[PDB]
mmCIF file of all heavy atoms in Angstrom:
data_model
loop_
_atom_site.group_PDB
_atom_site.id
_atom_site.type_symbol
_atom_site.label_atom_id
_atom_site.label_comp_id
_atom_site.label_asym_id
_atom_site.label_seq_id
_atom_site.Cartn_x
_atom_site.Cartn_y
_atom_site.Cartn_z
ATOM 1 N N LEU A 442 100.717 126.664 105.783
ATOM 2 C CA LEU A 442 99.773 126.257 106.819
ATOM 3 C C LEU A 442 98.802 125.220 106.260
ATOM 4 O O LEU A 442 98.174 124.504 107.048
ATOM 5 C CB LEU A 442 99.034 127.479 107.379
ATOM 6 C CG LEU A 442 97.996 127.567 108.506
ATOM 7 C CD1 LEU A 442 98.064 128.952 109.117
ATOM 8 C CD2 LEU A 442 96.561 127.317 108.021
ATOM 9 N N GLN A 443 98.637 125.185 104.913
ATOM 10 C CA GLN A 443 97.828 124.165 104.261
ATOM 11 C C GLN A 443 98.477 122.812 104.515
ATOM 12 O O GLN A 443 97.774 121.830 104.784
ATOM 13 C CB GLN A 443 97.599 124.450 102.778
ATOM 14 C CG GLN A 443 96.332 123.774 102.258
ATOM 15 C CD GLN A 443 95.894 124.295 100.904
ATOM 16 O OE1 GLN A 443 94.960 125.095 100.802
ATOM 17 N NE2 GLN A 443 96.530 123.801 99.852
ATOM 18 N N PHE A 444 99.843 122.767 104.447
ATOM 19 C CA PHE A 444 100.578 121.526 104.753
ATOM 20 C C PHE A 444 100.370 121.149 106.206
ATOM 21 O O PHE A 444 100.288 119.957 106.534
ATOM 22 C CB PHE A 444 102.102 121.607 104.568
ATOM 23 C CG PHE A 444 102.593 121.754 103.175
ATOM 24 C CD1 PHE A 444 103.119 122.959 102.737
ATOM 25 C CD2 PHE A 444 102.750 120.625 102.382
ATOM 26 C CE1 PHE A 444 103.644 123.079 101.465
ATOM 27 C CE2 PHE A 444 103.270 120.727 101.113
ATOM 28 C CZ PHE A 444 103.731 121.955 100.664
ATOM 29 N N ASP A 445 100.386 122.167 107.084
ATOM 30 C CA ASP A 445 100.228 121.961 108.525
ATOM 31 C C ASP A 445 98.858 121.356 108.827
ATOM 32 O O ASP A 445 98.746 120.435 109.652
ATOM 33 C CB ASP A 445 100.428 123.277 109.278
ATOM 34 C CG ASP A 445 101.831 123.839 109.110
ATOM 35 O OD1 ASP A 445 102.648 123.205 108.409
ATOM 36 O OD2 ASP A 445 102.116 124.913 109.679
ATOM 37 N N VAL A 446 97.813 121.881 108.160
ATOM 38 C CA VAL A 446 96.443 121.388 108.316
ATOM 39 C C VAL A 446 96.348 119.949 107.807
ATOM 40 O O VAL A 446 95.688 119.104 108.434
ATOM 41 C CB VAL A 446 95.473 122.357 107.601
ATOM 42 C CG1 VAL A 446 94.119 121.731 107.260
ATOM 43 C CG2 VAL A 446 95.261 123.599 108.455
ATOM 44 N N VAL A 447 97.017 119.658 106.667
ATOM 45 C CA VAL A 447 96.994 118.322 106.051
ATOM 46 C C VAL A 447 97.649 117.296 106.977
ATOM 47 O O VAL A 447 97.118 116.193 107.185
ATOM 48 C CB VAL A 447 97.645 118.380 104.651
ATOM 49 C CG1 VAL A 447 97.881 117.033 104.085
ATOM 50 C CG2 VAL A 447 96.644 118.974 103.676
ATOM 51 N N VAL A 448 98.795 117.678 107.573
ATOM 52 C CA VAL A 448 99.556 116.825 108.489
ATOM 53 C C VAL A 448 98.745 116.557 109.756
ATOM 54 O O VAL A 448 98.691 115.416 110.253
ATOM 55 C CB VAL A 448 100.935 117.467 108.774
ATOM 56 C CG1 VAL A 448 101.587 116.954 110.058
ATOM 57 C CG2 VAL A 448 101.876 117.213 107.602
ATOM 58 N N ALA A 449 98.068 117.612 110.264
ATOM 59 C CA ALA A 449 97.225 117.501 111.457
ATOM 60 C C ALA A 449 96.041 116.574 111.213
ATOM 61 O O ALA A 449 95.701 115.764 112.086
ATOM 62 C CB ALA A 449 96.747 118.888 111.888
ATOM 63 N N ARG A 450 95.382 116.716 110.046
ATOM 64 C CA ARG A 450 94.213 115.903 109.703
ATOM 65 C C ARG A 450 94.623 114.443 109.547
ATOM 66 O O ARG A 450 93.877 113.525 109.947
ATOM 67 C CB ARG A 450 93.572 116.438 108.422
ATOM 68 C CG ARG A 450 92.190 115.895 108.092
ATOM 69 C CD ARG A 450 91.490 116.848 107.130
ATOM 70 N NE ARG A 450 90.918 116.173 105.969
ATOM 71 C CZ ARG A 450 90.164 116.775 105.054
ATOM 72 N NH1 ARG A 450 89.899 118.069 105.159
ATOM 73 N NH2 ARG A 450 89.680 116.084 104.031
ATOM 74 N N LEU A 451 95.800 114.241 108.916
ATOM 75 C CA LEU A 451 96.357 112.920 108.653
ATOM 76 C C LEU A 451 96.630 112.191 109.959
ATOM 77 O O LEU A 451 96.287 111.009 110.106
ATOM 78 C CB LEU A 451 97.635 113.069 107.824
ATOM 79 C CG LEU A 451 98.316 111.892 107.123
ATOM 80 C CD1 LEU A 451 97.389 111.194 106.151
ATOM 81 C CD2 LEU A 451 99.555 112.383 106.397
ATOM 82 N N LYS A 452 97.227 112.912 110.925
ATOM 83 C CA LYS A 452 97.494 112.354 112.247
ATOM 84 C C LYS A 452 96.196 112.098 113.004
ATOM 85 O O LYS A 452 96.106 111.131 113.772
ATOM 86 C CB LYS A 452 98.398 113.305 113.035
ATOM 87 C CG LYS A 452 98.985 112.734 114.323
ATOM 88 C CD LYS A 452 99.675 111.403 114.104
ATOM 89 C CE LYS A 452 100.579 111.049 115.273
ATOM 90 N NZ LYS A 452 101.769 111.938 115.341
ATOM 91 N N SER A 453 95.222 113.013 112.844
ATOM 92 C CA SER A 453 93.958 112.966 113.576
ATOM 93 C C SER A 453 93.143 111.721 113.248
ATOM 94 O O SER A 453 92.645 111.040 114.153
ATOM 95 C CB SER A 453 93.140 114.225 113.286
ATOM 96 O OG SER A 453 92.488 114.129 112.033
ATOM 97 N N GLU A 454 92.999 111.399 111.956
ATOM 98 C CA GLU A 454 92.169 110.238 111.645
ATOM 99 C C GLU A 454 92.857 109.123 110.867
ATOM 100 O O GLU A 454 92.536 107.953 111.098
ATOM 101 C CB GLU A 454 90.897 110.668 110.909
ATOM 102 C CG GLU A 454 89.741 109.746 111.232
ATOM 103 C CD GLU A 454 88.520 110.030 110.417
ATOM 104 O OE1 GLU A 454 88.481 111.077 109.751
ATOM 105 O OE2 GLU A 454 87.605 109.189 110.423
ATOM 106 N N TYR A 455 93.806 109.425 109.979
ATOM 107 C CA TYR A 455 94.477 108.345 109.263
ATOM 108 C C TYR A 455 95.643 107.761 110.052
ATOM 109 O O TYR A 455 96.159 106.712 109.647
ATOM 110 C CB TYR A 455 94.897 108.795 107.856
ATOM 111 C CG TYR A 455 93.823 109.557 107.088
ATOM 112 C CD1 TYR A 455 93.854 110.942 106.964
ATOM 113 C CD2 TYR A 455 92.759 108.872 106.501
ATOM 114 C CE1 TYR A 455 92.868 111.631 106.262
ATOM 115 C CE2 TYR A 455 91.766 109.547 105.792
ATOM 116 C CZ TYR A 455 91.829 110.926 105.681
ATOM 117 O OH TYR A 455 90.850 111.604 104.991
ATOM 118 N N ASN A 456 96.008 108.402 111.178
ATOM 119 C CA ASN A 456 96.985 108.044 112.219
ATOM 120 C C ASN A 456 98.273 107.338 111.784
ATOM 121 O O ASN A 456 98.588 106.233 112.227
ATOM 122 C CB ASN A 456 96.254 107.279 113.355
ATOM 123 C CG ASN A 456 95.470 106.029 112.892
ATOM 124 O OD1 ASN A 456 96.021 105.009 112.481
ATOM 125 N ND2 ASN A 456 94.147 106.132 112.969
ATOM 126 N N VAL A 457 99.091 108.058 111.026
ATOM 127 C CA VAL A 457 100.411 107.611 110.607
ATOM 128 C C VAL A 457 101.426 108.581 111.187
ATOM 129 O O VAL A 457 101.078 109.686 111.616
ATOM 130 C CB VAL A 457 100.554 107.521 109.075
ATOM 131 C CG1 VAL A 457 99.733 106.362 108.530
ATOM 132 C CG2 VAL A 457 100.133 108.825 108.440
ATOM 133 N N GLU A 458 102.678 108.108 111.284
ATOM 134 C CA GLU A 458 103.790 108.942 111.747
ATOM 135 C C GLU A 458 104.013 110.147 110.830
ATOM 136 O O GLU A 458 104.182 111.268 111.328
ATOM 137 C CB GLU A 458 105.065 108.091 111.940
ATOM 138 C CG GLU A 458 105.813 107.460 110.731
ATOM 139 C CD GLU A 458 105.059 106.365 109.979
ATOM 140 O OE1 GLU A 458 103.997 105.893 110.440
ATOM 141 O OE2 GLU A 458 105.562 105.950 108.919
ATOM 142 N N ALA A 459 103.938 109.932 109.500
ATOM 143 C CA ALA A 459 104.017 110.948 108.433
ATOM 144 C C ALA A 459 105.239 111.862 108.529
ATOM 145 O O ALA A 459 105.106 113.091 108.567
ATOM 146 C CB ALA A 459 102.730 111.776 108.381
ATOM 147 N N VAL A 460 106.414 111.241 108.725
ATOM 148 C CA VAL A 460 107.682 111.973 108.730
ATOM 149 C C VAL A 460 107.883 112.639 107.373
ATOM 150 O O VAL A 460 107.709 112.017 106.317
ATOM 151 C CB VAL A 460 108.827 111.007 109.084
ATOM 152 C CG1 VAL A 460 110.196 111.697 109.069
ATOM 153 C CG2 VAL A 460 108.559 110.355 110.432
ATOM 154 N N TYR A 461 108.247 113.917 107.404
ATOM 155 C CA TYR A 461 108.374 114.738 106.210
ATOM 156 C C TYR A 461 109.486 115.757 106.426
ATOM 157 O O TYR A 461 110.315 115.604 107.332
ATOM 158 C CB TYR A 461 107.026 115.385 105.843
ATOM 159 C CG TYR A 461 106.519 116.491 106.760
ATOM 160 C CD1 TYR A 461 106.569 117.829 106.361
ATOM 161 C CD2 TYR A 461 105.949 116.195 108.001
ATOM 162 C CE1 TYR A 461 106.094 118.846 107.187
ATOM 163 C CE2 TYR A 461 105.476 117.202 108.835
ATOM 164 C CZ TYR A 461 105.550 118.521 108.422
ATOM 165 O OH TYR A 461 105.073 119.513 109.246
ATOM 166 N N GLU A 462 109.558 116.691 105.463
ATOM 167 C CA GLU A 462 110.452 117.848 105.267
ATOM 168 C C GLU A 462 111.832 117.451 104.719
ATOM 169 O O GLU A 462 112.829 118.129 105.029
ATOM 170 C CB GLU A 462 110.498 118.718 106.558
ATOM 171 C CG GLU A 462 110.955 120.217 106.562
ATOM 172 C CD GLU A 462 109.846 121.188 106.252
ATOM 173 O OE1 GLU A 462 108.664 120.824 106.429
ATOM 174 O OE2 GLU A 462 110.169 122.331 105.868
ATOM 175 N N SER A 463 111.977 116.253 104.117
ATOM 176 C CA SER A 463 113.246 115.880 103.482
ATOM 177 C C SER A 463 113.555 116.888 102.371
ATOM 178 O O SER A 463 112.631 117.303 101.660
ATOM 179 C CB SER A 463 113.167 114.464 102.917
ATOM 180 O OG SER A 463 112.908 113.521 103.940
ATOM 181 N N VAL A 464 114.813 117.359 102.302
ATOM 182 C CA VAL A 464 115.166 118.421 101.348
ATOM 183 C C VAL A 464 114.971 118.041 99.875
ATOM 184 O O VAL A 464 115.404 116.974 99.416
ATOM 185 C CB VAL A 464 116.590 118.932 101.646
ATOM 186 C CG1 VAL A 464 116.615 119.591 103.008
ATOM 187 C CG2 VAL A 464 117.624 117.804 101.674
ATOM 188 N N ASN A 465 114.252 118.899 99.148
ATOM 189 C CA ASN A 465 114.011 118.785 97.715
ATOM 190 C C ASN A 465 113.601 120.159 97.201
ATOM 191 O O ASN A 465 113.050 120.964 97.956
ATOM 192 C CB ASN A 465 112.943 117.730 97.384
ATOM 193 C CG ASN A 465 111.565 118.136 97.840
ATOM 194 O OD1 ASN A 465 111.355 118.394 99.024
ATOM 195 N ND2 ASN A 465 110.615 118.188 96.914
ATOM 196 N N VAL A 466 113.873 120.437 95.931
ATOM 197 C CA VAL A 466 113.458 121.699 95.324
ATOM 198 C C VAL A 466 112.641 121.370 94.065
ATOM 199 O O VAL A 466 113.085 120.561 93.235
ATOM 200 C CB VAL A 466 114.649 122.679 95.129
ATOM 201 C CG1 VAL A 466 115.680 122.325 94.024
ATOM 202 C CG2 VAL A 466 114.141 124.117 94.996
ATOM 203 N N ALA A 467 111.422 121.922 93.955
ATOM 204 C CA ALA A 467 110.591 121.563 92.802
ATOM 205 C C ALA A 467 109.545 122.627 92.491
ATOM 206 O O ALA A 467 109.164 123.429 93.347
ATOM 207 C CB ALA A 467 109.855 120.233 93.045
ATOM 208 N N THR A 468 109.135 122.648 91.217
ATOM 209 C CA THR A 468 108.061 123.476 90.676
ATOM 210 C C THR A 468 107.239 122.588 89.739
ATOM 211 O O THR A 468 107.828 121.803 88.989
ATOM 212 C CB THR A 468 108.621 124.724 89.979
ATOM 213 O OG1 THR A 468 109.442 125.433 90.912
ATOM 214 C CG2 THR A 468 107.493 125.683 89.644
ATOM 215 N N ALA A 469 105.907 122.709 89.735
ATOM 216 C CA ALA A 469 105.039 121.822 88.958
ATOM 217 C C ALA A 469 104.465 122.499 87.714
ATOM 218 O O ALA A 469 103.762 123.509 87.829
ATOM 219 C CB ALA A 469 103.884 121.312 89.813
ATOM 220 N N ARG A 470 104.753 121.945 86.531
ATOM 221 C CA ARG A 470 104.193 122.441 85.271
ATOM 222 C C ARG A 470 103.619 121.245 84.527
ATOM 223 O O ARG A 470 104.385 120.364 84.132
ATOM 224 C CB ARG A 470 105.241 123.134 84.395
ATOM 225 C CG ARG A 470 105.561 124.602 84.666
ATOM 226 C CD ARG A 470 104.384 125.590 84.610
ATOM 227 N NE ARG A 470 103.665 125.768 85.874
ATOM 228 C CZ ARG A 470 104.083 126.540 86.878
ATOM 229 N NH1 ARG A 470 105.209 127.236 86.774
ATOM 230 N NH2 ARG A 470 103.365 126.632 87.986
ATOM 231 N N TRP A 471 102.296 121.206 84.314
ATOM 232 C CA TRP A 471 101.701 120.092 83.566
ATOM 233 C C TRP A 471 102.074 120.173 82.087
ATOM 234 O O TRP A 471 102.041 121.255 81.497
ATOM 235 C CB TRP A 471 100.185 120.111 83.722
ATOM 236 C CG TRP A 471 99.719 119.501 85.000
ATOM 237 C CD1 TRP A 471 99.385 118.198 85.230
ATOM 238 C CD2 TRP A 471 99.539 120.190 86.239
ATOM 239 N NE1 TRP A 471 99.003 118.035 86.543
ATOM 240 C CE2 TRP A 471 99.089 119.244 87.183
ATOM 241 C CE3 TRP A 471 99.713 121.518 86.642
ATOM 242 C CZ2 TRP A 471 98.811 119.586 88.506
ATOM 243 C CZ3 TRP A 471 99.437 121.857 87.953
ATOM 244 C CH2 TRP A 471 98.991 120.894 88.870
ATOM 245 N N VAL A 472 102.484 119.051 81.489
ATOM 246 C CA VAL A 472 102.959 119.066 80.103
ATOM 247 C C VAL A 472 101.996 118.356 79.147
ATOM 248 O O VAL A 472 101.558 117.224 79.397
ATOM 249 C CB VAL A 472 104.406 118.536 79.984
ATOM 250 C CG1 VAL A 472 105.323 119.433 80.747
ATOM 251 C CG2 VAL A 472 104.603 117.126 80.561
ATOM 252 N N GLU A 473 101.539 119.085 78.125
ATOM 253 C CA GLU A 473 100.658 118.505 77.119
ATOM 254 C C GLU A 473 101.241 118.822 75.747
ATOM 255 O O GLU A 473 101.564 119.980 75.471
ATOM 256 C CB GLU A 473 99.213 119.036 77.226
ATOM 257 C CG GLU A 473 98.493 118.851 78.578
ATOM 258 C CD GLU A 473 98.754 119.950 79.600
ATOM 259 O OE1 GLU A 473 99.660 120.780 79.394
ATOM 260 O OE2 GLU A 473 98.023 119.987 80.613
ATOM 261 N N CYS A 474 101.421 117.811 74.901
ATOM 262 C CA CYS A 474 101.889 118.051 73.537
ATOM 263 C C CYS A 474 100.938 117.378 72.563
ATOM 264 O O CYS A 474 100.739 116.161 72.654
ATOM 265 C CB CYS A 474 103.318 117.545 73.326
ATOM 266 S SG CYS A 474 103.950 117.837 71.654
ATOM 267 N N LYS A 475 100.305 118.167 71.686
ATOM 268 C CA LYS A 475 99.411 117.584 70.687
ATOM 269 C C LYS A 475 100.180 116.728 69.676
ATOM 270 O O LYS A 475 99.681 115.689 69.228
ATOM 271 C CB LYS A 475 98.588 118.696 70.020
ATOM 272 C CG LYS A 475 99.375 119.878 69.460
ATOM 273 C CD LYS A 475 98.446 120.983 68.995
ATOM 274 C CE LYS A 475 99.223 122.113 68.335
ATOM 275 N NZ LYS A 475 100.262 122.694 69.231
ATOM 276 N N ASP A 476 101.374 117.185 69.285
ATOM 277 C CA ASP A 476 102.217 116.529 68.291
ATOM 278 C C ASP A 476 102.715 115.148 68.712
ATOM 279 O O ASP A 476 103.113 114.929 69.861
ATOM 280 C CB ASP A 476 103.397 117.431 67.938
ATOM 281 C CG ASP A 476 102.950 118.755 67.352
ATOM 282 O OD1 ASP A 476 101.948 118.758 66.610
ATOM 283 O OD2 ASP A 476 103.590 119.789 67.631
ATOM 284 N N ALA A 477 102.696 114.221 67.759
ATOM 285 C CA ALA A 477 103.156 112.851 67.936
ATOM 286 C C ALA A 477 104.604 112.790 67.473
ATOM 287 O O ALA A 477 104.969 113.539 66.558
ATOM 288 C CB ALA A 477 102.295 111.869 67.139
ATOM 289 N N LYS A 478 105.447 112.038 68.217
ATOM 290 C CA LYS A 478 106.911 111.782 68.045
ATOM 291 C C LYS A 478 107.805 112.870 68.636
ATOM 292 O O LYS A 478 109.014 112.726 68.562
ATOM 293 C CB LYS A 478 107.393 111.457 66.610
ATOM 294 C CG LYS A 478 106.918 110.135 65.953
ATOM 295 C CD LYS A 478 107.546 108.852 66.552
ATOM 296 C CE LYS A 478 106.706 108.114 67.598
ATOM 297 N NZ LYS A 478 107.371 106.850 68.020
ATOM 298 N N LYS A 479 107.255 113.964 69.160
ATOM 299 C CA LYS A 479 107.957 115.067 69.824
ATOM 300 C C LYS A 479 107.920 114.968 71.346
ATOM 301 O O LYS A 479 108.947 115.216 72.018
ATOM 302 C CB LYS A 479 107.372 116.416 69.385
ATOM 303 C CG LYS A 479 108.179 117.154 68.309
ATOM 304 C CD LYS A 479 108.273 116.383 66.995
ATOM 305 C CE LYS A 479 109.097 117.137 65.961
ATOM 306 N NZ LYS A 479 109.182 116.404 64.665
ATOM 307 N N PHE A 480 106.744 114.628 71.890
ATOM 308 C CA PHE A 480 106.557 114.439 73.328
ATOM 309 C C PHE A 480 107.423 113.291 73.846
ATOM 310 O O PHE A 480 107.889 113.347 74.990
ATOM 311 C CB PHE A 480 105.077 114.207 73.632
ATOM 312 C CG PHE A 480 104.721 114.382 75.081
ATOM 313 C CD1 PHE A 480 105.171 115.502 75.777
ATOM 314 C CD2 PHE A 480 103.906 113.464 75.734
ATOM 315 C CE1 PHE A 480 104.843 115.690 77.111
ATOM 316 C CE2 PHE A 480 103.571 113.641 77.072
ATOM 317 C CZ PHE A 480 104.041 114.760 77.758
#
């Protein structure tokens, strides 16, 4: 519903078509490596 609210707000004032829901599968993990030449 957070996506739904974002899409509604986007249409409400930034007024774009904002076509979405194209199939993709993903998970987000931020990557930090202190070591040099490994990252």
Side-chain angles (χ1 to χ4, degrees):
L442 183 153
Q443 204 166 258
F444 292 108
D445 297 0
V446 159
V447 169
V448 159
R450 192 160 130 174
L451 193 58
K452 192 52 164 291
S453 79
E454 211 187 348
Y455 315 102
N456 55 69
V457 289
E458 68 293 350
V460 178
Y461 71 106
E462 200 86 22
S463 299
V464 295
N465 68 302
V466 71
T468 304
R470 276 303 88 80
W471 279 269
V472 297
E473 303 86 348
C474 181
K475 52 187 185 303
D476 299 324
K478 294 289 97 176
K479 260 62 181 181
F480 196 47

